[model samples]
Target: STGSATTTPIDSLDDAYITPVQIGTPAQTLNLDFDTGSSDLWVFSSETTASEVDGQTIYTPSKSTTAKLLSGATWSISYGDGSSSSGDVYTDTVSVGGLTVTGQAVESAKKVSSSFTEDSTIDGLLGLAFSTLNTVSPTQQKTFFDNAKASLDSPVFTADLGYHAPGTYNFGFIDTTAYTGSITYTAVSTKQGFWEWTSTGYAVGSGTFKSTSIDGIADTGTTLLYLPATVVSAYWAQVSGAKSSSSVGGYVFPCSATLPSFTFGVGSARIVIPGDYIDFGPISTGSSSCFGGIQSSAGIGINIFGDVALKAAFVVFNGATTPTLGFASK
Candidate 1:
């Protein structure tokens, strides 16, 4: 079976993308963060305390005929940003778009981080990464994609995320009209349980494309793009009055500065991010200082090609025995 659904940006900053998911037999819907960075489909639920719920919706397993408790099964996950969630598990009829999966594991959040409590629009998260990254203990469970791969026409999915517009996530087949030109394929190293790949190189503006291999992961859940210090420095160097500041966090510069576009290689193809996109926006309301969308990954152990980078291209996550990633200009 095949399925296609629209994934929309949650805020003006396009910090994260979310898709509606139908869970349980009665088809209770929730807006879930479709994160490719982690593996654990969890949701705010009736199991969560009222004090922790805030304005977010919660899943009620008691109302679903198909909901079954996974005895003794539990899951917990902590992100790079220090946000964490953990809870008990349930298996129910889960559907996204038109594709349905029977007995898909659904983690019910008993506790959530302060950041989640503050973000009322998002109900929880649906992880699309490999099942190896699943945080379920006693018995690790498979992700929705992993479980549906066999039933899908093709063991692949595509992410066509947008800047400020609604994007689409398609399963089983690629949407030819979603992208421009041809897609360039790269071998994915899932050893780290991520859609990890290497870019051939990068360039600032029209300058020479540095022909060095840069390793990074494609993460839709992350808000910013992070690169090696050397690469980040070279790009920021072109902008006037740009400096790394601890108070403002990372690189900040005058909002009026003429920022240069960033280009990264996908095999031989080059994906250029517009300068305006690099100017993440002012650090504060009516502030003259603005944060750079691209920042140094020195503090982070791994370079992350997050939404700032992914939004510029069409991406395919191929789940063949030997996984691969495909990128195309949009």
Candidate 2:
């Protein structure tokens, strides 16, 4: 029945996770960042301006017998980090973790910003965000996940990220073994093309847990946890030598500083982030100074619970009418 669930291994790239994908008739493969923050499944391609395609692996539609181009279709997007790419669109076969989606809209790059061309590891992005966020012109594109949802055993996917090692992304079914205790849930509002949720309150470094409605999105593509500036400062106060360093950006502290546990209320559950996890790692070797994984989302508009925060919990992306999110300790 092909009833078994499909699980994809996520490789840690220090900051982002990469997963393998097969595109085209003969299967031109790419290792892409499975981003929840975006809604375009785009890659470097034959249509791209030759000078703009740096070290990326290109998907040549001409080389694929099954690739079909939709006339006058195009897509362009700019990431929060300022990386941008514009491309033509095609309908092709796309497969991830043994799950194949036929006639999927695969946007291939025609032009890309330096941020994309300079990074050689990720050949493309497989968006897991709401389909509404898609950038295809005239008609928005449906993500591979969106097209494959109807065929899935379950209409859900789970992210089990890691601190520094490889983790997993399980589609269609939840691996009960990835997390411990019960999965505490919070309502997700996706009208804005994000898995938006509110934290009733938060506490850091043994301080009093105050009440506040902290609205933020849980983003998988982003690399760091972003909160309000005051919240970031409050936590920094508890750590000796912790300061906002312009050099390293965000908060930096002595490697020896004792970091306090960070807690956030998710409905009835209090998801805890250990001090060690907050310590992303040193800025440089033997420098006695390290960069913090948590930062303030002053300009990004919405706070993001990136890989750093997601790794500490087992997260469920359920697309039911309230789009509820389940979280548990990993």
Candidate 3:
């Protein structure tokens, strides 16, 4: 009927949330980062360069009786942060929670970018984006979600990410107990292969709601909220010691600084992000320096509503019609 998986945030880093998944016939269990921004299910494996892997458990396709190779097939993917992984492909059975997806394309990494290599704790990534974003060549691959959609009671999944707490990614069915208030939805345009939408307006801290439209994406893969330069500038302006610190890049302020709530208009709803959440821990460990989670989306084409923002709401990646996104306070 449906599947529900526990998604846990990694320590204080908040870099990404991870869930346990199984691959192959006998099922090799691995901790995977469920990313909605990309559409390739890749794993660190025996195929990966030894130097590129650390403590992660690598996938061994040969051990699975049902694993098949898409002859001469391969895949390579790159991200905005320059993080990437490229490798050969395999068709295998993948399972998440209680649901099992057979004949799913599992990209086994032969080489990984420095970013992935340095992140020793992560074993692989499970993509939840649309089928159009699949990067496998010749015949693009389909994700586990794509293959399993037909069997789902409903073609929808909700992310209930909490602030430094455990959450659940529930698929095929909606759980009313996870969120409070009503769920407000907005039309999502997937023309660019993203969960894209235009915001009604935004307000920095407690200032007036500046009603300028902004085009952005709701990406579970992203770590921080990225907004337009002017918007970022406006918000940090409220903090007493806040400055665009060149040393660590984006805006930074003293941990003791009093922050204000940032609000955004979604449909007819006003979604507000509590001020304390903006402080993304210390710039350097044990220091009073805190990095602002909301930063400029200048270099990146689309503004990203990342984990920092998503944690404040219960989100539904609705597959109905043009794909609307539903949000409610958690």
Candidate of highest lDDT: 1
TM-score of 2: 0.93
Candidate 1, pairs of clashing residues:
none
95-147 in candidate 3: lDDT tens per residue? 88888888999999999988888887789999888879988997898878778
lDDT of 3 at 176: 93
Q: The CA-based lDDT of model 3 is what?
A: 0.88
Better of 1 and 3 by lDDT: 1
TM-score of each: 0.98, 0.93, 0.97
Model 3 vs. true fold: TM: 0.97
**Local distance difference test, per candidate?**
0.93, 0.83, 0.88
Candidate 2 overall Cα lDDT vs. reference?
0.83
Write the number of the candidate with greater TM-score, choosing between 2 and 3: 3
Those runs of model 3 whose alpha carbons end farther than 4 Å from true positions after fitting are: none
Across 108-129, the per-residue lDDT of candidate 1 in tens digits comes to 9999989999999899999998
Regions more than 4 Å wrong, model 1:
none
Report the number of backbone clashes for model 3. 0
State the number of backbone clashes in model 1: 0
